[PDB]
Design a protein around this ligand. Structure first.
Ligand SMILES: Nc1ncnc2c1ncn2[C@@H]1O[C@@H]2COP(=O)(O)O[C@H]2[C@H]1O
Ligand SMILES: Nc1ncnc2c1ncn2[C@@H]1O[C@@H]2COP(=O)(O)O[C@H]2[C@H]1O
Lengths: 201, 108, 244, 17, 235, 90, 99, 54, 201
């Protein structure tokens, strides 16, 4: 696919955990490509609280907006969630790879279509669904993750209420107060961090 | 005659909004699940602990959970996360139902 | 399945047999029906296999004239081509839709049998025994009896062939920019022919022998397709009126 | 008849003989 | 029901393919082994019998005494004049019988728009030619009338002798009261990708223009439903 | 009957010819993979099953014919040379 | 009755029919001439080699329709390559030759 | 079109109980034509469309 | 230049107001391009509340996501706001123009970058900034749009009280309350849809 003729002239660097691959404000003069691992894209405000938009695993590009129009700036931050290997190719040398293989451009420009949708749909989630609704969907999303812990009753997940507020967009207190609110209605269960839901499977 | 009446209630203009038949049939299965645990490339340690816990196929392990397997004083957490790592490529994971299992055995 | 070996233990000899792609596996793979003995070549023809619930081989009724066999308890073996080359030849000359005429003489070997001809001879029936010719505008009008130029053939004139039957009624029909006096049965099959290739059939009781000279001329100018289509409506309206 | 055919690899064998 | 006595699926209308103003499509997927011929025969005797509608019944042409007679000023004989009166689109609001007049003298095939406009009767097909002139002297003038009835009755069956309510002038013509022209039903056991005993009910209908194909199906069906009150209830 | 079958025997003044036209080439398409087929995917059969289309068949490639080309021994000499084809498992 | 795969002899090398397995319909000569009349080709040589006599061409074909490929051309019949030796013991020498 | 009670509505006038096994009920308001289309759309609705116990 | 080479194979077809250029559910077999006027794109929920993702003015493309990957459907609804002239070019004949001239594709995918930057940096403001702060930024954002008309006092735009809440993420009732509140303090103006802000420029 895309791997075919592309990783022959790169620059292996690798970025440690909790690193900074993209700095919002700098000039885009280097294209990135994910080989192995994953990465999370988020942004910050004037305080310090973060807000994750969407997760991007392997086979995805990082910072490709500054390729068409020369003279742009980084849109959002790109913090490496885990140990991942990313290549480095300047936009100047990238344009030369298109003249010899337009197919490579057909791949990168293809992913920009899906990303434009998932980002727009993310905005609607912060206008229609509330705290209870947004977090409810997160419980099922984390259960589908490889790091999830299956349970005879339902699904067991291990995640702090501080990270949840960075996904749905709220405080850490609200997440907890509502978490135990569903316990009285006999829907789910919680014992600190262990959240065992019901109805799954 | 009542049966015939219900066979025409759609013309008398009645508030009955129900879908006819929305069935999708395309018989398929996963014979790869019938493959032994010797297709995930494991170590001698796990290759002796699992088989000792009535585990000969990959389907006999998925049916269980990684919360009760920790109770047995012959396993651990690293012996479960390693399995799920390989199951990622096969398309399997702990906490999934099975079909046509067990496979061909000694039907009485 | 994902392995030929794994699938071998599936459809062995147990209660695990389940239908699946058996429908798609057999679509464009013709088969040679061999009913010995075999004198000419019509003994071995090709037809597109179709799955049907049962433990018997259903054969076409119109092709029974070639295999000259009855359904009293006979038996026939069937062969299946493997190589693609033979699969192509099975639809080139082995097929039956291309071998309609007779190699010996030249007359159509495949003709209506017992039922397919009964339905046609019934719909195409008059009464003959007329007197002569007259004005006749009111009085007679007896069913759909044969006559020169009278009865309801002049009283009931309709442009379109659609509105004519219903309550059983005949009159004047328009065919080949000309005026004729026939019934709905005399123009029920003689109107589907011009649909593909226009011709001219002499006014006579349509029978097993009459169609023989028809299929012949319906193959002289055109290929093989425009002629085999006519052999479709003949079967449908062959078992319909043969039940009433 | 074996003189004429319909191959030539659909345009990848005319330069093979 | 609530007592669980049915245990069977009941068909229902979902979509109406309106390809025209008279001809449409009425599908019915949910069917079983037996109901395919039941509904196909329980309505077949209605759409071809118990149908209101309206069409041409009597036409009194000036100068015309009978059918076999002739007429000076027309190309075709009187026999063909009544021929093109079977397929005449007419839609009257609320009236059992309406009389229309036609006064036109000159050269040019008289259409349906030449008839005196009435705020009651609606003409669906105004470009419908019924006669053809030849010269200056050529001039037609008849009082066509359209009324209701019940089913279809040819002019050969509704005829007696040369005497009637108004012998001189009138011209007996086929009256197609029933909006529907013809109805055909084919079982054809369909072979879907899955279930075997699956059949659909293809109801082919081609009305004239008196009513809508959408309300025509429910109307004819409701009438049948008005014959089962002493079964489902009555207590 | 069948699709575009009587049209191939009427377009050209022979029947025995059409045979090899879709024979020694058709069987060669399978033993050579599928890449040799350069024409578009338009000229291809249609198989109704599971709401999709498979197989391929032929009889829709006969369009640009010619008289003299290659002998008859090279048809399967350089064909199985450029492409070996086989069957492997994981 | 229907047969697809079964056992085979040694010197004869032909399809048989045991108990658990069915029997194959012997393609009589009466059906050979009826095929030659059409003027076929490949569908005639198959009902003589792989589908009966030819052995090394029967196994290779079985490994061609399993992966969705196509079977190549058959080889030399077994009832023919042994005849060369059968006639060799009759004081007469036989030798094959190409072009 | 109209549609305003043009036909008669079937009503139970009298039932006949000749036996505890067989009965002969009958309706009165039936137009000429509905006495066959309603009988044919019922003859095949009680030959297999009936539960029962055994 | 390349743009003129694109209009040489177009099909001029004017679309009246309140029309339907893109129907969610049909097959994408026609590429659209805006010449004059403006168009809006939005989605709907289960009730009836709308949600505008991004606006598209003149010089922009309509429905270009179903070009990279053949075999897709219309994502959102596209209703013609005003009388606009849009061209028509099938995707089939378009792919043949890319293989011979990749430069034509460099133009379309060039506008897909800006539409992603104004959406990713908007989510952050819809989780920390309050109603007053979110709406304030929206006023300046709409003023930078080419469809904005110059005003002697500031800028004159035309937007409903719903579309505003669809950008700042809130209810329609809250928008109307604050909007009228700023009128008493002599800061802005509103007479139905036309909102004339002050302090701009
Ligand atoms: N929501 C998102 N989804 C995917 N990628 C994003 C998202 N937000 C920002 N990015 C990437 O972060 C990059 C920052 O620099 P660029 O503008 O070059 O390109 C940007 C995008 O590729
Ligand atoms: N947030 C957005 N920004 C720009 N364009 C959009 C946005 N959302 C939808 N669209 C366009 O609306 C179109 C709907 O149909 P398409 O899927 O063909 O292509 C879609 C996009 O081109």
């Amino acid at each position: 696919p895309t791997l075919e003729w592309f990783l022959s002239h790169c620059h292996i660097h690798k970025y440690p955990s909790k690193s900074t691959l993209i700095h919002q404000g700098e000039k885009a003069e280097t294209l990135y490509y994910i080989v192995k691992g994953s990465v999370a894209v988020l942004i910050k405000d004037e305080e310090g609280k973060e807000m994750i938009l969407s997760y991007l695993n392997q086979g995805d590009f990082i910072g490709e907006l500054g390729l068409f129009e020369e003279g742009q700036e980084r849109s959002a931050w790109v913090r490496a969630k885990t140990a991942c290997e990313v290549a480095e190719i300047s936009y100047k040398k990238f344009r030369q790879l298109i003249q010899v293989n337009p197919d490579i451009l057909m791949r990168l420009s293809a992913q920009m279509a899906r990303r434009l949708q998932v980002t727009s749909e993310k905005v609607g989630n912060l206008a229609f669904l509330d705290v209870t609704g947004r977090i409810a969907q997160t419980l099922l999303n984390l259960a589908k993750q490889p790091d999830a812990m299956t349970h005879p009753d339902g699904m067991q997940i291990k995640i702090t209420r501080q990270e949840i507020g960075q996904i749905v967009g709220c405080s850490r207190e609200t997440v907890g107060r509502i978490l135990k609110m569903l316990e009285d209605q006999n829907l789910i269960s919680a014992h600190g961090k262990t959240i065992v839901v019901y109805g799954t499977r | 005659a009542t049966i015939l009446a219900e066979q025409l209630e759609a013309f008398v203009d009645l508030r009955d909004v129900r879908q006819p038949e929305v069935k999708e049939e395309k018989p398929e299965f996963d014979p790869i699940l019938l493959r032994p645990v010797d297709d995930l490339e494991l170590t001698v340690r796990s290759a002796n602990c699992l088989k000792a816990e009535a585990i000969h196929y990959i389907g006999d392990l998925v049916q269980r959970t990684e919360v009760e397997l920790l109770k047995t004083p012959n396993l651990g957490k690293k012996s479960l996360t390693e399995i799920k790592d390989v199951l990622a490529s096969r398309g399997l994971s702990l906490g999934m139902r099975l079909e046509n299992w067990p496979p061909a055995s000694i039907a009485d | 399945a994902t392995t030929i070996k794994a699938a071998k233990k599936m459809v062995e000899r147990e209660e695990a047999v389940v239908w699946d792609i058996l429908d798609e596996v057999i679509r464009e793979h013709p088969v040679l029906l061999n009913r010995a003995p075999t004198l000419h070549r019509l003994g071995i023809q090709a037809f597109e296999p179709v799955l049907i619930e049962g433990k018997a081989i259903q054969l076409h009724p119109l092709v029974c004239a070639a295999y000259n066999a009855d359904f009293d308890g006979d038996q026939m073996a069937v062969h299946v081509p493997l190589t693609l080359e033979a699969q192509l030849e099975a639809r080139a000359l082995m097929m039956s839709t291309n071998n309609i005429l007779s190699p010996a003489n030249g007359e159509p070997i495949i003709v209506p049998s017992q039922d397919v001809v009964l339905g046609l001879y019934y719909m195409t029936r008059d009464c003959v025994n007329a007197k002569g010719e007259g004005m006749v505008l009111t009085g007679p009008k007896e069913a759909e009896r044969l006559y020169r130029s009278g009865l309801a053939s002049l009283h009931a004139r309709v442009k379109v062939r659609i509105t004519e039957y219903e309550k059983d009624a005949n009159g004047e029909l328009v065919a080949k920019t000309s005026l004729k006096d026939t019934t709905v049965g005399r123009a029920i099959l003689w109107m589907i022919v011009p649909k593909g290739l226009p011709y001219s059939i002499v006014n006579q009781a349509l029978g097993k022998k009459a169609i023989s000279k028809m299929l012949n001329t319906c193959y002289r100018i055109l290929g093989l397709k425009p002629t085999v289509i006519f052999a479709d409506q003949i079967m449908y309206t062959g078992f319909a009126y043969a039940a009433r | 008849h074996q003189d004429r055919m319909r191959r030539r690899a659909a345009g990848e064998a005319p330069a093979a003989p | 029901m609530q007592g669980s006595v049915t245990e069977f699926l009941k068909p229902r209308l979902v979509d109406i393919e309106q390809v025209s103003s008279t001809h449409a499509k009425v599908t019915l997927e949910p069917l079983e082994r037996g109901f395919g011929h039941t509904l196909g025969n329980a309505l077949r005797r209605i759409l071809l019998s118990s149908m209101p509608g309206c069409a041409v019944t009597e036409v009194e042409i000036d100068g015309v005494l009978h059918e076999y007679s002739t007429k000076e000023g027309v190309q075709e004989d009187i026999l063909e004049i009544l021929l093109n009166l079977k397929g005449l689109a007419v839609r009257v609001q609320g009236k059992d019988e309406v009389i229309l007049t036609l006064n036109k003298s000159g050269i040019g095939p008289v259409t349906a728009a030449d008839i005196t406009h009435d705020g009651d009767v609606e003409i669906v097909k105004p470009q419908h030619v019924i006669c053809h002139l030849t010269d200056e002297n050529a001039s037609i003038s008849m009082r066509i009338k359209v009324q209701r009835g019940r089913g279809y009755v040819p002019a050969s069956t509704r005829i007696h002798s040369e005497e009637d309510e108004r012998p001189i002038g009138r011209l007996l013509v086929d009256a197609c009261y029933s909006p529907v022209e013809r109805i055909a039903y084919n079982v054809e056991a369909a072979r879907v990708e899955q279930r075997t005993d699956l059949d659909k009910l293809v109801i082919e209908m081609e009305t004239n223009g008196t009513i809508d194909p959408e309300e025509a199906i429910r109307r004819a069906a409701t009438i049948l439903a008005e014959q089962l009150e002493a079964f489902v209830d009555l207590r | 009957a069948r699709v575009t079958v009587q049209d191939a025997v009427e377009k050209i003044g022979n029947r025995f010819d059409l045979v090899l036209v879709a024979a020694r080439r058709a069987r060669q398409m399978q033993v050579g993979g599928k890449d040799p087929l350069v024409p578009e995917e338009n000229d291809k059969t249609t198989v109704i099953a599971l709401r999709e289309i498979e197989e391929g068949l032929i009889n829709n490639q006969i369009l640009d014919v010619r008289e003299r080309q290659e002998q008859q021994e090279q048809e399967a000499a350089e064909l199985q040379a450029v492409t070996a084809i086989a069957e492997g498992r994981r | 009755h229907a047969r697809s795969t079964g056992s085979y002899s040694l010197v004869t090398q032909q399809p048989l029919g045991g108990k658990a397995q069915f029997g194959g319909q012997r393609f009589g000569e009466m059906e050979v001439w009826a095929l030659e009349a059409y003027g076929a080709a490949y569908t005639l040589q198959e009902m003589l080699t792989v589908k009966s006599d030819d052995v090394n061409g029967r196994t290779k074909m079985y490994k061609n329709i399993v992966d969705g490929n196509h079977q190549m051309e058959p080889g030399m019949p077994e009832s023919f390559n042994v005849l060369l030796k059968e006639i060799r013991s009759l004081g007469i020498n036989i030798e094959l030759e190409d072009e």
